[PDB]
Amino acid sequence: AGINYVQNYNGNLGDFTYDESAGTFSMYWEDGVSSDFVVGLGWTTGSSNAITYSAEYSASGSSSYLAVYGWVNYPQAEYYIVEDYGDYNPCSSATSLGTVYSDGSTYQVCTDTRTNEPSITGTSTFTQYFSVRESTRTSGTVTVANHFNFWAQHGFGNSDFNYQVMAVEAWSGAGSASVTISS
């Protein structure tokens, strides 16, 4: 997998375990969380390369994602390719950009502006981009290039990437997950 980056934003909200050279991690939050964590494994510098994963993901009662997750340095952007999720669809509140088809499913696409919020530069203003899979799954290949090229039509810089990971995120409710990245 060539993992060279560990994502750990508030992993101590639950039980985050990882092994970089295996490309495995797990995150248990079965007692619930009241604030956001984002944990996972991947690459110091993102690219349009496809990502292949497999997971156990049990988040039905949780505001949670199983997602490709990363940033663009500038113009600053936080992005998600949500493969499965719990009780919160980001495209319910956010601005719809339509849909894109990739790897066997429609994805709902949306965007939001975050003003003076936590970022990879302290607190800042950035744009969020989300692809949310209509047919949810816990294993497969994400053709990242199809999401990047679609988002790029709506302002996504599609260059000058920061880190890029397969992640589990949750900020409300309880759940558990165990993930393997192969590529």
Curated annotation (Swiss-Prot):
Annotated disulfide bonds: C91-C110
Catalytic activity: Endohydrolysis of (1->4)-beta-D-xylosidic linkages in xylans
A matching Pfam family: Glyco_hydro_11
Catalytic site positions: E78 (nucleophile), E169 (proton donor)
EC number(s) stated in the UniProt entry for this protein: 3.2.1.8
Record keywords, A-Z: Carbohydrate metabolism, Disulfide bond, Glycosidase, Hydrolase, Polysaccharide degradation, Secreted, Signal, Xylan degradation
EC top class named in words: hydrolase
Recorded GO CC terms: extracellular region
Main location class: secreted
UniProt KW Coiled coil keyword: no
One GO-annotated biological process of the protein: xylan catabolic process
pH profile of the protein: Optimum pH is 3.0.
Pathway where it operates: Glycan degradation; xylan degradation
Keyword Secreted set for record: yes
InterPro entries named among the record's database cross-references: ConA-like_dom_sf (IPR013320), GH11/12 (IPR013319), GH11_AS_1 (IPR018208), GH11_AS_2 (IPR033119), GH11_dom (IPR033123), Glyco_hydro_11 (IPR001137)
Subcellular location: Secreted
GO molecular function, one term: endo-1,4-beta-xylanase activity
Family the entry assigns: Belongs to the glycosyl hydrolase 11 (cellulase G) family.
Function: Endo-1,4-beta-xylanase involved in the hydrolysis of xylan, a major structural heterogeneous polysaccharide found in plant biomass representing the second most abundant polysaccharide in the biosphere, after cellulose.
Protein name stated in the entry: Endo-1,4-beta-xylanase A
